[PDB]
Amino acid sequence: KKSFSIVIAGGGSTFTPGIVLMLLDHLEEFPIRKLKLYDNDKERQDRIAGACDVFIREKAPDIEFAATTDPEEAFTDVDFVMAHIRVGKYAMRALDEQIPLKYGVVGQETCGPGGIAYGMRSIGGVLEILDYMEKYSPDAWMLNYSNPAAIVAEATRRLRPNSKILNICDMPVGIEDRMAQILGLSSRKEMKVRYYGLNHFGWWTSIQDQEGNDLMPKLKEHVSQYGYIPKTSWNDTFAKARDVQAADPDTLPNTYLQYYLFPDDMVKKSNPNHTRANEVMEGREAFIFSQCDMITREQSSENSEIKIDDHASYIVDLARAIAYNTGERMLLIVENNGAIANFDPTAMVEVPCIVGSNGPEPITVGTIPQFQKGLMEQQVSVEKLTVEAWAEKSFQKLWQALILSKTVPNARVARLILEDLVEANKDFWPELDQSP
Ligand SMILES: NC(=O)c1ccc[n+]([C@@H]2O[C@H](COP(=O)([O-])OP(=O)(O)OC[C@H]3O[C@@H](n4cnc5c(N)ncnc54)[C@H](O)[C@@H]3O)[C@@H](O)[C@H]2O)c1
Ligand SMILES: O=P(O)(O)OC[C@H]1O[C@@H](O)[C@H](O)[C@@H](O)[C@@H]1O
Numbered sequence: 001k002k003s004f005s006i007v008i009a010g011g012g013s014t015f016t017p018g019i020v021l022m023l024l025d026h027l028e029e030f031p032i033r034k035l036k037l038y039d040n041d042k043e044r045q046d047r048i049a050g051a052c053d054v055f056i057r058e059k060a061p062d063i064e065f066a067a068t069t070d071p072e073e074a075f076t077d078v079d080f081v082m083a084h085i086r087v088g089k090y091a092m093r094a095l096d097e098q099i100p101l102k103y104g105v106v107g108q109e110t111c112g113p114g115g116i117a118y119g120m121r122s123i124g125g126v127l128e129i130l131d132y133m134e135k136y137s138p139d140a141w142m143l144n145y146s147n148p149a150a151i152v153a154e155a156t157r158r159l160r161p162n163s164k165i166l167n168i169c170d171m172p173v174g175i176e177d178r179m180a181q182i183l184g185l186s187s188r189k190e191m192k193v194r195y196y197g198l199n200h201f202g203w204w205t206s207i208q209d210q211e212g213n214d215l216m217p218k219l220k221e222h223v224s225q226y227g228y229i230p231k232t233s234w235n236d237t238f239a240k241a242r243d244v245q246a247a248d249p250d251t252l253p254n255t256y257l258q259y260y261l262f263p264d265d266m267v268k269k270s271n272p273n274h275t276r277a278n279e280v281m282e283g284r285e286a287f288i289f290s291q292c293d294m295i296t297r298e299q300s301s302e303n304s305e306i307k308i309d310d311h312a313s314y315i316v317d318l319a320r321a322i323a324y325n326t327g328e329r330m331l332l333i334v335e336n337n338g339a340i341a342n343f344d345p346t347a348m349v350e351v352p353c354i355v356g357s358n359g360p361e362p363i364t365v366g367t368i369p370q371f372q373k374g375l376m377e378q379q380v381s382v383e384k385l386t387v388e389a390w391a392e393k394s395f396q397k398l399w400q401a402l403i404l405s406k407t408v409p410n411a412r413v414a415r416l417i418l419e420d421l422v423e424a425n426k427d428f429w430p431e432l433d434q435s436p
C-alpha cells in the first residue's frame with residue numbers, strides 16, 4: 001500500500017501486548033500487512049498471542065497474524081524485527097539485583113554488576129535472532145530494545161559490524177516527555193535537542209523549540225528544584241535528577257547517572273529481599289501474562305485493562321523514519337568514529353542522528369568537557385571489557401569490568417560478586433577460563 005511486515009522477537013513477553021496495542025493506534029502513519037510473534041517457549045507466547053489475536057480482529061482484521069516458535073516461519077518475509085527479548089527472564093533479573101546488594105553494591109537491571117550479568121546473558125540471545133533475520137530476510141532492520149543496550153551494542157559492533165541492527169532506549173524519550181510537560185509544550189517533538197553520552201549515561205546540552213528559542217534556562221531552574229517532576233521523595237529517580245544535575249550546571253542529566261554518582265543512595269532504595277524484578281512480577285507479569293488468558297476465553301476487549309503503551313511510540317517513529325526516509329532527528333546508539341571528537345572512536349555512543357532509509361546519520365558533537373569524558377571513558381571500558389570477556393571466554397576480563405565500574409568499591413568485592421554471578425548464570429553464560 002505500502003504496508004510493512006513485522007515480527008516481534010520476544011512475543012511471550014509482557015511488553016508485547018502493550019506494543020501490538022500501540023502498533024494498532026499508529027496504523028494510519030505506519031500501516032501493517034503482517035504481524036508475527038516469535039519466542040522460544042510456546043506456552044508463554046501462545047497465551048500472549050491469544051490476546052493480540054483478539055486485538056487485531058477488532059481494529060484491523062485484514063492484518064495477517066501468527067505466533068510461532070519456528071525461526072523460518074517467524075523471520076521469512078519481514079521488513080522489521082522488533083526485539084525485546086529478556087534472556088533468563090525475571091528470575092535472572094531478580095538475582096542480578098539481589099547478588100550485588102548482598103555486598104552493599106548497586107543492584108539494577110542495566111547498571112552495575114546486575115547490568116553486566118544481564119549483558120553477558122543477552123549477547124548470545126541477540127546474535128541468535130539477528131542471524132535468523134539475515135538468514136531469512138537479509139534486507140530487514142532489527143530494532144533492538146533488548147537490554148542492556150550499551151553492552152549489546154558493543155557486541156554487535158565487534159561481532160556483526162555490517163548488520164542492520166539499531167540498539168535503542170526509551171529513557172531519553174521519557175525524560176523529554178517530562179521536559180515538555182514542564183515547559184507547557186504539547187509534545188517533546190516540539191523540541192530540538194543536542195545530547196551525548198553512552199546508553200543510560202548522558203547529558204542534554206541544548207534544548208530549543210522549533211523557532212530556535214532557548215528552553216534550557218527554564219528547564220534548568222525547574223530541574224534544580226524539582227528534578228524532572230512537573231509542578232503539581234528525595235531518592236525517587238526523577239526527583240533525584242536535581243542532585244545529579246548539580247554535578248554539571250551547564251547541562252541536564254540522564255536519570256541513570258544517579259546509580260554512578262550516588263551509588264550508596266541507590267543501594268538502599270531497593271528492598272534487598274524484594275527488588276524491582278519482584279515489583280514487576282506482581283505489578284505486571286501475572287497481571288497481564290494471564291489477563292491475556294481471559295481475553296482469549298472471552299475473545300473480546302472488556303473495556304480492557306491492559307493500557308496502550310504510548311511510551312513505545314518511539315519504536316514506531318524509528319521504523320517510520322527508515323520506511324519513508326523522514327530524516328527525523330532521534331537519539332540512537334551508534335559507533336562514534338568522530339561524532340565525539342575527543343572520545344574513543346570505537347565506542348558506541350548515544351547521540352542525535354538524522355534517520356533515513358539507509359539508517360542513522362550521526363550529527364557531530366564536537367569536543368566534550370573533562371568531567372563527562374572521564375566518566376564516559378571509565379564506563380565504556382566496563383562495557384568493552386564485558387564484550388571481550390564474552391568473546392574470549394575470559395574470567396579475568398570480566399573481573400576487570402567489575403573493578404572498573406564506578407558502582408563497585410574495590411577489586412575484592414568485584415571478585416566476590418563475579419564468583420556469585422558465574423554460579424547464578426551457568427545456564428546462560430559461556431564457560432569462562434581461569435577458572436570456573
Ligand atoms: N532499551 C529500552 O529502552 C528498554 C525499555 C523497556 C524494556 N526493555 C527491554 O525489553 C525486554 C523485555 O522486557 P519485559 O519486561 O517485557 O520482559 P519479559 O520477560 O516480559 O519479555 C521477554 C521475552 O523474551 C523471550 N525470550 C527470552 N529469551 C529469548 C530467546 N533467547 N529467544 C527468543 N525469545 C526469548 C522470553 O520468553 C520473554 O517472553 C527486556 O530486555 C527489557 O530490558 C528495554
Ligand atoms: O524496571 P522496568 O519497569 O522493567 O524499567 C526498565 C526500563 O526502564 C526504561 O526507562 C529504560 O529505558 C529501559 O532500558 C529499562 O529496561
Ligand SMILES: [Mn+2]
Pocket residue numbers: 149168169170171200
Ligand atoms: Mn533504556
